[PDB]
Amino acid sequence: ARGPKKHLKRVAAPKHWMLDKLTGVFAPRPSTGPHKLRECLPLIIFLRNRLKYALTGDEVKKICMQRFIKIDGKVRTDITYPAGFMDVISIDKTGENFRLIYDTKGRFAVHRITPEEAKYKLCKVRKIFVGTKGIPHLVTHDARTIRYPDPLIKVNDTIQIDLETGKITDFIKFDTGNLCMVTGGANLGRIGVITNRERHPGSFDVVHVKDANGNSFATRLSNIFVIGKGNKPWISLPRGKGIRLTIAEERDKRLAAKQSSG
């Protein structure tokens, strides 16, 4: 190509959007923004495919141009805006609040939250650097840059940001025994407690996590997001607490639910 690409084939779209094959040739290409193309959820997909508010792409635009949708407290009229992990979506017309959290299957879930909880979010510290005049700067996973952070905050930590002022309230350090969620890989969407960290100089580090039921797994250090201190999360969790079931016990649960239905 001679420059940036502007389209996205429907079969080449991320598979956690759960698009069907026969609807069209194209998929909504996410706009540039805080989150990556392969790790976001476009506003149109959430607004018509998940919530069933709109039937076509035109109705999504008609909803958005009435300034009804807010993302992290700010009105977004773009229908392909990239919304990502730990983002807050507010609809004041219906008085609804949602937080984008992966379910145990690695897909963004429709997770309703209290309006009190919708005032803050958690962010992962990606970079720490000193700028001009010796002023510290902290860069999070969602492209936020914050000046004068707490001197004890380092990389791979978690900070709580108040969405109205955009300022740090408190933080969680990356230590063994804390609660974390996996944000990528084969264990995406799982929740557990950090057991130990393996350091490989010049390469990727590996972190071992164990869930509430006692199942153990491992990921890379870049795929770990610290949620809470100890066993207590600082956010509300979806229907599944982050425990991944096997296919046999999913079948057993489904059969038990069917038997008790009716």
Binding site: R147, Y148, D150, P151, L152
Partner: peptide, 30 residues
């Protein structure tokens, strides 16, 4: 905004340095 943020961080940095030096002094004395 610049003045207020600078003053607040100056207070926080003084607090942090004092805490770290006090902990180091306690470690050395023991």
């Amino acid at each position: 905004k610049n003045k207020e943020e600078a003053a607040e961080y100056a207070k926080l940095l003084a607090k942090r340095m004092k805490e770290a030096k006090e902990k180091r002094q306690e470690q050395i004395a023991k």
